[PDB]
């Protein structure tokens with residue numbers, strides 16, 4: 001079968017803590033003797049509108065940060081700021097700290113989100129970095145400091161920390177160096193994203209998945225050149241397909257006996273005609289948050 | 300609205316592998332018992348037509364290889380309860396959570412922690428279909444993977460994976476070994492009944508749309524539960540039970556829309572169609588979000 005699947009979240013759960021400053025509580029990520037969290041926790045209502053973070057931060061003491069791991073309070077023995085992430089040095093090391101790395105993902109890549117509130121894990125789901133550097137998440141008040149991640153063997157690669165919601169209801173955040181994905185800023189203002197586009201290489205991965213699971217009504221006998229497909233793709237605000245994308249799709253191509261450019265001819269027909277009421281893998285819409293690797297691992 | 304799974308860490312800490320000869324699947328290690336599908340004791344050729352009691356009497360504790368990772372847990376006792384094997388082991392699982400075993404109803408959702416060789420690979424949310432199948436994602440070696448809900452700190456185990464049906468859906472038991480539906484653990488052709496739409500979950504979805512301001516479909520009329528059930532069955536929708544009416548209670552109260560009034564609105568959508576409109580950004584009515592799922596994502 002075929003399902004939007006997240007990585008098992010245990011290794012990350014054992015890192016989550018609650019961080020409080022003033023009347024603001026959000027989540028932190030406790031790795032070794034450091035807790036990472038969004039810097040906008042240090043803001044008041046008034047601050048949030050135009051926070052001079054270097055200025056606000058210097059006025060805080062270690063003791064203004066309350067960090068709790070369950071019942072236990074952790075003692076902050078130092079604080080600093082790296083871009084939009086606050087780093088809290090604590091007197092004790094997290095024994096549940098996994099093998100980890102910090103990475104910056106590219107748009108079109110997917111990752112798992114462990115949504116937390118008051119330092120407690122609440123749910124896990126799979127998301128993609130949109131081409132306009134938003135993510136379509138499920139994040140409520142208190143969710144800031146929730147992280148996104150991938151797991152390779154025994155290693156957790158952290159790629160996202162959550163900071164904000166935009167008026168359209170999508171979400172924005174940073175990598176674990178504190179740099180935003182996209183043109184956003186951690187200030188309480190209405191911010192719009194660039195126009196989004198659909199992740200074409202992922203739509204093609206998902207069409208291959210629908211074939212692998214016996215769903216092929218959208219196929220056709222026609223074919224297309226790469227550039228002629230890309231011309232139509234861009235017309236419909238789909239990302240153009242690169243030769244690296246073609247190559248990445250090979251295993252799915254091999255496994256199903258459907259040349260990539262044949263699948264592109266199928267997608268072009270769907271873009272131009274629509275789904276005629278039909279569904280693919282249950283969906284009325286072309287799904288673009290499965291990468292080729294996601295589909296491969298799972299089939 | 301996304302399908303959101305529960306954080307899987309409390310369950311990851313209970314997964315082991317169970318091997319008889321070369322047949323390896325997953326087991327669930329709680330306190331000093333390991334629970335797994337009984338067909339682990341069957342050779343490939345045994346599965347064609349197994350005699351489980353006879354296969355079991357021939358077995359001894361020392362024919363069972365139970366491993367957490369690569370660490371052996373010695374089996375000191377074995378019994379069969381319906382279609383699950385219970386293996387008493389000489390070590391109480393230090394990671395055992397607060398837990399219980401529950402048998403869920405069609406329509407209820409749970410998270411599945413897909414595992415291979417006792418290693419978690421992925422977590423996703425499933426609904427139990429009215430025909431007592433789940434639309435899972437399971438490969439060879441996945442049996443013994445479990446489905447669960449988490450309430451506060453208590454893990455309620457409701458599913459253990461045993462088999463795949465011709466249509467590519469999946470079937471299994473509760474943790475007492477009792478199959479959901481009319482299936483048996485024999486490698487013989489079996490077929491799921493025709494599936495129906497989960498009415499209580501569609502209703503939850505409509506409540507979700509209203510909570511978010513999308514309420515064009517509300518009408519000025521009501522209906523009896525009996526009239527609705529009779530009409531719904533003509534559209535291959537499940538009849539509502541009293542338990543369904545009850546679990547819609549909070550969403551009814553949150554919106555001020557009586558359950559039976561929402562039923563009349565759904566009847567009108569069934570009889571007259573969407574007339575080209577959308578609800579929550581979709582022309583399809585969604586049926587795998589329960590009233591709890593809606594609450595846990597809106598509030």
Ligand SMILES: *[C@H](O)[C@H](C[C@@H]1CCNC1=O)NC(=O)[C@H](CC(C)C)NC(=O)OC[C@@H]1CCC(=O)N1CC1CCCCC1
Nearest residue numbers: 338437438439440441442461462463464465484485488489
């Ligand atoms: C345990 O890991 C395994 C999990 C399976 C295999 C891959 N995906 C799964 O979900 N379970 C079995 O192999 C199971 C063992 C039996 C003792 C129950 N047998 C099984 O799943 O296949 C037999 C099924 C039973 C109904 C049926 O018609 N059938 C034949 C195939 C035909 C092709 C499509 C799938 C069903």
